[PDB]
Amino acid sequence: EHLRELRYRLIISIIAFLIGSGIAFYFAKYVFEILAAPILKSYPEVELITLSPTEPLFILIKISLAVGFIIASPVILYQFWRFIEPALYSHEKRAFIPLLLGSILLFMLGALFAYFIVLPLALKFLLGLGFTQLLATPYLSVDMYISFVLKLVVAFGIAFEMPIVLYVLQKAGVITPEQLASFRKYFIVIAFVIGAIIAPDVSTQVLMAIPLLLLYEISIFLGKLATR
């Protein structure tokens, strides 16, 4: 069962992700304007660029994909908790609901955090320094910005489930808070890895690596509270 449930439930997750990506397709234009909103109001001078002669569709597909992954998040979380919880660690069926709902609300919190906090601060470290506006008025690509935003929101959306999963592991006695405290530097490496992947440059990389390390020191605290 331990082998098969992984496969099955993951297939269900891919199904929900695909269907969710399908539903988000038609609304991807409105979502595109919503995503273009922060850079528009915060920096009216900056104008977007379509890059290669025609690629309007790639952005549509990427947006529909990411948003589709976000829509499928309750289902994916459900399958995840259903894969872990019932087998070993807890054996409490009443503790399933606030755990799932909590993880969902924290996923949403991660999204909103990425969009409303990290994003306008990310633009501040890039286009937001001094008189440099000379060097981008109509200078900016759409794909760069949009992919950056999507990857940022999805990343921080997932990474906000760190304190939960880690609290569960530390409560179950799987991972000791000490083992996490000794792993801090390697998690710095991980943070700069994620940052290197999603963020275009060093500035934004280190910028979003900060809350990642922040959420890591939250988990070690919840571990001390799990043991005591």
mmCIF file of C-alpha atoms in Angstrom:
data_model
loop_
_atom_site.group_PDB
_atom_site.id
_atom_site.type_symbol
_atom_site.label_atom_id
_atom_site.label_comp_id
_atom_site.label_asym_id
_atom_site.label_seq_id
_atom_site.Cartn_x
_atom_site.Cartn_y
_atom_site.Cartn_z
ATOM 1 C CA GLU A 1 0.000 0.000 0.000
ATOM 2 C CA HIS A 2 2.839 2.375 0.901
ATOM 3 C CA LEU A 3 4.241 1.998 -2.618
ATOM 4 C CA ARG A 4 1.000 2.203 -4.613
ATOM 5 C CA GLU A 5 -0.793 5.032 -2.782
ATOM 6 C CA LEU A 6 2.069 7.348 -3.737
ATOM 7 C CA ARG A 7 1.591 6.602 -7.441
ATOM 8 C CA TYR A 8 -2.224 6.748 -7.346
ATOM 9 C CA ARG A 9 -2.644 9.888 -5.210
ATOM 10 C CA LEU A 10 0.089 11.634 -7.208
ATOM 11 C CA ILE A 11 -1.783 10.761 -10.400
ATOM 12 C CA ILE A 12 -4.883 12.302 -8.835
ATOM 13 C CA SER A 13 -2.777 15.377 -8.041
ATOM 14 C CA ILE A 14 -1.646 15.605 -11.672
ATOM 15 C CA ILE A 15 -5.277 15.241 -12.760
ATOM 16 C CA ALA A 16 -6.454 18.070 -10.499
ATOM 17 C CA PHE A 17 -3.475 20.139 -11.642
ATOM 18 C CA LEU A 18 -4.303 19.542 -15.314
ATOM 19 C CA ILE A 19 -8.027 20.253 -14.994
ATOM 20 C CA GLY A 20 -7.276 23.288 -12.842
ATOM 21 C CA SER A 21 -4.840 24.468 -15.501
ATOM 22 C CA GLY A 22 -7.625 24.005 -18.034
ATOM 23 C CA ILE A 23 -10.138 26.103 -16.103
ATOM 24 C CA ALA A 24 -7.615 28.899 -15.543
ATOM 25 C CA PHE A 25 -6.985 29.142 -19.296
ATOM 26 C CA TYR A 26 -9.917 31.389 -20.230
ATOM 27 C CA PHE A 27 -9.341 33.745 -17.294
ATOM 28 C CA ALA A 28 -5.598 33.959 -17.970
ATOM 29 C CA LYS A 29 -6.007 37.345 -19.691
ATOM 30 C CA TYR A 30 -7.676 39.007 -16.706
ATOM 31 C CA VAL A 31 -5.084 37.325 -14.485
ATOM 32 C CA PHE A 32 -2.430 38.656 -16.872
ATOM 33 C CA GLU A 33 -3.660 42.208 -16.298
ATOM 34 C CA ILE A 34 -3.811 41.553 -12.544
ATOM 35 C CA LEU A 35 -0.171 40.446 -12.670
ATOM 36 C CA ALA A 36 0.749 43.456 -14.806
ATOM 37 C CA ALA A 37 -0.927 45.732 -12.244
ATOM 38 C CA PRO A 38 1.926 46.046 -9.683
ATOM 39 C CA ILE A 39 4.541 47.173 -12.211
ATOM 40 C CA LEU A 40 2.013 49.544 -13.800
ATOM 41 C CA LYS A 41 1.032 51.568 -10.730
ATOM 42 C CA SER A 42 4.381 51.429 -8.920
ATOM 43 C CA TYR A 43 6.356 52.324 -12.049
ATOM 44 C CA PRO A 44 4.197 54.083 -14.691
ATOM 45 C CA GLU A 45 7.316 55.020 -16.675
ATOM 46 C CA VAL A 46 8.273 51.392 -17.350
ATOM 47 C CA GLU A 47 6.850 49.840 -20.536
ATOM 48 C CA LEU A 48 6.629 46.104 -21.277
ATOM 49 C CA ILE A 49 8.156 44.366 -24.313
ATOM 50 C CA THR A 50 6.945 41.331 -26.290
ATOM 51 C CA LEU A 51 10.520 40.132 -26.971
ATOM 52 C CA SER A 52 10.615 37.802 -29.989
ATOM 53 C CA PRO A 53 8.396 39.020 -32.862
ATOM 54 C CA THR A 54 5.327 37.128 -31.653
ATOM 55 C CA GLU A 55 5.042 35.247 -28.363
ATOM 56 C CA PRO A 56 1.777 36.370 -26.708
ATOM 57 C CA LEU A 57 0.651 32.781 -26.132
ATOM 58 C CA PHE A 58 3.526 31.468 -23.986
ATOM 59 C CA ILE A 59 2.630 33.933 -21.228
ATOM 60 C CA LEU A 60 -1.010 32.831 -21.437
ATOM 61 C CA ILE A 61 -0.011 29.171 -21.092
ATOM 62 C CA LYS A 62 2.409 29.817 -18.212
ATOM 63 C CA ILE A 63 -0.159 31.895 -16.318
ATOM 64 C CA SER A 64 -2.884 29.290 -16.853
ATOM 65 C CA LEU A 65 -0.423 26.631 -15.653
ATOM 66 C CA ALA A 66 0.645 28.383 -12.448
ATOM 67 C CA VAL A 67 -2.861 29.573 -11.566
ATOM 68 C CA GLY A 68 -4.080 26.080 -12.418
ATOM 69 C CA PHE A 69 -1.579 24.671 -9.939
ATOM 70 C CA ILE A 70 -2.837 27.126 -7.319
ATOM 71 C CA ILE A 71 -6.468 26.118 -7.883
ATOM 72 C CA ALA A 72 -5.563 22.441 -7.463
ATOM 73 C CA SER A 73 -3.749 23.166 -4.186
ATOM 74 C CA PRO A 74 -6.563 22.041 -1.859
ATOM 75 C CA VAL A 75 -6.782 18.737 -3.740
ATOM 76 C CA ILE A 76 -3.007 18.229 -3.850
ATOM 77 C CA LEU A 77 -2.777 19.053 -0.143
ATOM 78 C CA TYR A 78 -5.650 16.650 0.537
ATOM 79 C CA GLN A 79 -3.887 13.806 -1.279
ATOM 80 C CA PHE A 80 -0.622 14.679 0.486
ATOM 81 C CA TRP A 81 -2.078 14.630 4.003
ATOM 82 C CA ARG A 82 -4.014 11.500 3.025
ATOM 83 C CA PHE A 83 -0.713 9.919 2.001
ATOM 84 C CA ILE A 84 1.163 10.807 5.193
ATOM 85 C CA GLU A 85 -1.285 11.084 8.114
ATOM 86 C CA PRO A 86 -3.446 7.916 8.096
ATOM 87 C CA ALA A 87 -0.509 5.497 7.865
ATOM 88 C CA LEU A 88 1.799 6.192 10.810
ATOM 89 C CA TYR A 89 2.545 9.522 12.475
ATOM 90 C CA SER A 90 -0.645 10.727 14.192
ATOM 91 C CA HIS A 91 -3.498 8.177 14.175
ATOM 92 C CA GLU A 92 -6.022 10.922 14.940
ATOM 93 C CA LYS A 93 -8.847 11.496 12.451
ATOM 94 C CA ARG A 94 -10.108 14.666 14.144
ATOM 95 C CA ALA A 95 -6.691 16.308 13.771
ATOM 96 C CA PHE A 96 -6.878 15.949 9.983
ATOM 97 C CA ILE A 97 -9.309 18.804 9.284
ATOM 98 C CA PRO A 98 -7.586 21.714 11.066
ATOM 99 C CA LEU A 99 -4.305 20.442 9.615
ATOM 100 C CA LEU A 100 -5.604 20.490 6.041
ATOM 101 C CA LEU A 101 -7.465 23.788 6.441
ATOM 102 C CA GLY A 102 -4.419 25.233 8.187
ATOM 103 C CA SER A 103 -2.068 24.160 5.404
ATOM 104 C CA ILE A 104 -4.470 25.625 2.840
ATOM 105 C CA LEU A 105 -4.767 28.953 4.660
ATOM 106 C CA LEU A 106 -0.969 29.008 4.948
ATOM 107 C CA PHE A 107 -0.643 28.305 1.229
ATOM 108 C CA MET A 108 -2.925 31.272 0.540
ATOM 109 C CA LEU A 109 -0.919 33.273 3.067
ATOM 110 C CA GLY A 110 2.229 32.366 1.145
ATOM 111 C CA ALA A 111 0.671 33.495 -2.125
ATOM 112 C CA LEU A 112 -0.579 36.815 -0.726
ATOM 113 C CA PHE A 113 2.777 37.315 1.009
ATOM 114 C CA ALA A 114 4.681 36.790 -2.238
ATOM 115 C CA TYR A 115 2.431 39.119 -4.236
ATOM 116 C CA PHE A 116 1.805 41.949 -1.757
ATOM 117 C CA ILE A 117 5.137 41.950 0.109
ATOM 118 C CA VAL A 118 7.984 40.269 -1.798
ATOM 119 C CA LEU A 119 6.970 41.507 -5.266
ATOM 120 C CA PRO A 120 6.838 45.287 -4.720
ATOM 121 C CA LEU A 121 10.069 44.971 -2.733
ATOM 122 C CA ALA A 122 11.560 42.963 -5.604
ATOM 123 C CA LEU A 123 10.809 45.795 -8.024
ATOM 124 C CA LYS A 124 12.345 48.249 -5.566
ATOM 125 C CA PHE A 125 15.730 46.499 -5.650
ATOM 126 C CA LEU A 126 15.670 46.257 -9.445
ATOM 127 C CA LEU A 127 14.012 49.267 -11.070
ATOM 128 C CA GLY A 128 13.440 51.162 -7.833
ATOM 129 C CA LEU A 129 16.801 52.809 -7.169
ATOM 130 C CA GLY A 130 17.246 56.519 -7.895
ATOM 131 C CA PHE A 131 17.283 58.184 -11.317
ATOM 132 C CA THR A 132 17.996 54.945 -13.173
ATOM 133 C CA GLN A 133 14.620 55.259 -14.960
ATOM 134 C CA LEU A 134 16.658 56.407 -17.975
ATOM 135 C CA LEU A 135 17.727 52.797 -18.386
ATOM 136 C CA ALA A 136 14.289 51.402 -18.448
ATOM 137 C CA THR A 137 11.417 53.399 -19.901
ATOM 138 C CA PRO A 138 10.233 50.938 -22.613
ATOM 139 C CA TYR A 139 12.971 48.508 -21.654
ATOM 140 C CA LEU A 140 11.253 45.586 -19.914
ATOM 141 C CA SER A 141 10.306 42.110 -21.168
ATOM 142 C CA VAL A 142 6.902 40.663 -20.301
ATOM 143 C CA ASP A 143 8.080 37.052 -20.035
ATOM 144 C CA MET A 144 10.812 37.887 -17.516
ATOM 145 C CA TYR A 145 8.493 39.791 -15.183
ATOM 146 C CA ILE A 146 5.524 37.421 -15.500
ATOM 147 C CA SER A 147 7.531 34.207 -15.093
ATOM 148 C CA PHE A 148 9.287 35.842 -12.149
ATOM 149 C CA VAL A 149 5.949 36.696 -10.510
ATOM 150 C CA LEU A 150 4.392 33.278 -11.118
ATOM 151 C CA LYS A 151 7.453 31.377 -9.911
ATOM 152 C CA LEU A 152 7.684 33.690 -6.891
ATOM 153 C CA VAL A 153 4.037 33.220 -5.898
ATOM 154 C CA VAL A 154 4.110 29.444 -6.387
ATOM 155 C CA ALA A 155 7.429 29.116 -4.543
ATOM 156 C CA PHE A 156 6.470 31.221 -1.517
ATOM 157 C CA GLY A 157 3.053 29.568 -1.622
ATOM 158 C CA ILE A 158 4.614 26.136 -1.173
ATOM 159 C CA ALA A 159 7.349 27.266 1.238
ATOM 160 C CA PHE A 160 4.771 28.559 3.725
ATOM 161 C CA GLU A 161 3.931 24.926 4.427
ATOM 162 C CA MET A 162 7.407 24.541 5.922
ATOM 163 C CA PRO A 163 6.455 25.375 9.536
ATOM 164 C CA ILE A 164 3.511 22.960 9.377
ATOM 165 C CA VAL A 165 5.213 19.893 7.902
ATOM 166 C CA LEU A 166 8.260 20.522 10.087
ATOM 167 C CA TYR A 167 6.127 20.966 13.217
ATOM 168 C CA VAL A 168 4.516 17.625 12.391
ATOM 169 C CA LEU A 169 7.888 15.941 11.876
ATOM 170 C CA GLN A 170 9.287 17.420 15.092
ATOM 171 C CA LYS A 171 6.157 16.462 17.039
ATOM 172 C CA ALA A 172 6.329 12.915 15.680
ATOM 173 C CA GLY A 173 9.966 12.833 16.774
ATOM 174 C CA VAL A 174 11.296 12.245 13.266
ATOM 175 C CA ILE A 175 13.411 15.392 13.104
ATOM 176 C CA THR A 176 14.957 16.924 16.208
ATOM 177 C CA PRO A 177 15.146 20.747 16.460
ATOM 178 C CA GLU A 178 18.888 20.254 16.984
ATOM 179 C CA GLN A 179 19.192 18.442 13.648
ATOM 180 C CA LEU A 180 17.505 21.443 12.030
ATOM 181 C CA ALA A 181 19.695 23.933 13.898
ATOM 182 C CA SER A 182 22.805 22.132 12.636
ATOM 183 C CA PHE A 183 21.461 22.125 9.073
ATOM 184 C CA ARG A 184 21.024 25.917 8.884
ATOM 185 C CA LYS A 185 23.964 26.558 6.537
ATOM 186 C CA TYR A 186 22.865 23.850 4.112
ATOM 187 C CA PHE A 187 19.409 25.429 4.144
ATOM 188 C CA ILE A 188 21.120 28.721 3.338
ATOM 189 C CA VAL A 189 22.533 26.887 0.334
ATOM 190 C CA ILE A 190 19.016 25.662 -0.489
ATOM 191 C CA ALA A 191 17.606 29.183 -0.093
ATOM 192 C CA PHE A 192 20.139 30.633 -2.514
ATOM 193 C CA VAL A 193 19.435 27.706 -4.857
ATOM 194 C CA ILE A 194 15.704 28.435 -4.975
ATOM 195 C CA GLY A 195 16.541 32.124 -5.233
ATOM 196 C CA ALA A 196 18.900 31.441 -8.128
ATOM 197 C CA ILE A 197 16.232 29.375 -9.880
ATOM 198 C CA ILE A 198 13.244 31.725 -9.628
ATOM 199 C CA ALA A 199 14.901 35.163 -9.368
ATOM 200 C CA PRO A 200 16.640 36.708 -12.426
ATOM 201 C CA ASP A 201 19.553 38.390 -10.618
ATOM 202 C CA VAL A 202 21.540 38.498 -7.373
ATOM 203 C CA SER A 203 19.463 41.280 -5.791
ATOM 204 C CA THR A 204 16.108 39.496 -5.976
ATOM 205 C CA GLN A 205 17.825 36.168 -5.236
ATOM 206 C CA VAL A 206 19.204 37.288 -1.875
ATOM 207 C CA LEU A 207 15.995 39.252 -1.312
ATOM 208 C CA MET A 208 13.723 36.201 -1.448
ATOM 209 C CA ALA A 209 16.335 34.002 0.218
ATOM 210 C CA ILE A 210 15.734 36.032 3.380
ATOM 211 C CA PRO A 211 12.139 34.957 4.120
ATOM 212 C CA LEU A 212 13.151 31.378 3.291
ATOM 213 C CA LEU A 213 15.753 31.388 6.059
ATOM 214 C CA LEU A 214 13.205 33.213 8.196
ATOM 215 C CA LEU A 215 10.687 30.373 7.864
ATOM 216 C CA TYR A 216 13.453 27.919 8.742
ATOM 217 C CA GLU A 217 14.081 29.594 12.092
ATOM 218 C CA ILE A 218 10.325 29.520 12.666
ATOM 219 C CA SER A 219 10.324 25.734 12.300
ATOM 220 C CA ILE A 220 13.116 25.232 14.841
ATOM 221 C CA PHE A 221 11.090 27.309 17.292
ATOM 222 C CA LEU A 222 7.997 25.182 16.715
ATOM 223 C CA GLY A 223 10.252 22.195 17.354
ATOM 224 C CA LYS A 224 11.204 23.444 20.805
ATOM 225 C CA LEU A 225 7.482 23.931 21.408
ATOM 226 C CA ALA A 226 6.817 20.437 20.052
ATOM 227 C CA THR A 227 9.279 18.831 22.462
ATOM 228 C CA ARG A 228 8.206 20.983 25.411
#
